Amino acid sequence: MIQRTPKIQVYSRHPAENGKSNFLNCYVSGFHPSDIEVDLLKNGERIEKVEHSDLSFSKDWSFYLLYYTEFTPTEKDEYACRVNHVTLSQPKIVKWDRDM
């Protein structure tokens, strides 16, 4: 077999501004096999109600998946996406960089 590591992007639907409602996205793509765990974290704690899209793949057969949840950004609150995959010795935790 040949395995492919997920490419991880954590980002808000719209440019984030404190107090204004938004959506938190974690988009994993280009990975294989398809079985994968993705969680959103608020200040280190797992957010309980997180939705995701239906499994789909690109032309090169590599899978992609979107995880998301409604949220209201604050100056203090920190967010991150924890991706668990067989190609990762330990779960990859990517922090949300709101102004990149």
């Binding site: 077999m1 040949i2 492919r4 490419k7 992007q9 980002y11 639907r13 719209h14 959506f23 996205n25 988009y27 793509s29 280009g30 294989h32 096999p33 398809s34 079985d35 899209s53 239906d54 499994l55 789909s56 793949f57 057969w61 590599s62 899978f63 992609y64 979107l66 998301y68 102004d99 990149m100």
Partner: protein
Amino acid sequence: GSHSMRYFSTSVSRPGRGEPRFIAVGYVDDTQFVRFDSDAASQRMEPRAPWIEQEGPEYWDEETGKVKAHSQTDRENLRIALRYYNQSEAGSHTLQMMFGCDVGSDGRFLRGYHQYAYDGKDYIALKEDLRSWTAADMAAQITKRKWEAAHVAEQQRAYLEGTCVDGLRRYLENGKETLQRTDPPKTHMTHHPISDHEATLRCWALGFYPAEITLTWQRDGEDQTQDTELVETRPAGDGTFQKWAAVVVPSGEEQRYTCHVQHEGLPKPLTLRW
């Protein structure tokens, strides 16, 4: 412009955890409209776009039957694949399938697709002429001979040039106010010092549809390919897409660099300069 219909299915074996998991999704262009999931309770093809709700109970009956039937045959195909590759039934394997067609602006047929992938790599595929198959390896060649004997190609061809383009034509009409849509990207630039002699210029494209787009960095009017960072196009979640391209530049030399954005929704390609 042109349009496409595509069906993607993924079958994943789970040894000592029951039957293989089967997930199918349907797309018209970059908009998903249906799904099926063998681990869900409904056990039916479900609508995932507004403009497909207007389909009658028959449609949902027919589509449900087909996709359920397909899950069972790919279930068996996973078994058959274990044989061909002499693999144990203790490991997990994947069977992927793409099917669909392309039509031009005039709704006329352009192209058809019927493709399989085992464990992430080509297995068998219907060639562009829809008359012959492309076997990826020794195993797929056995299937290729079977499919030649059973005349699968002529059946699929007719379906692709007929049923598929007709279905595509209908879906477009029904999803008219949503599928004929073309949203231009909102662009902007970010800038961050990496250290005391270097900074990052990141070129942003947001809220565009369809997903197809090109972001290019030039330095002094010359493509700056190798040195660039370019992320995959990502869904915003609202039906539009996002993407960015970044270059690390020497501090004070920002003005040498230009970002070029190409997209169907743009009258002319955009240029951005910090």
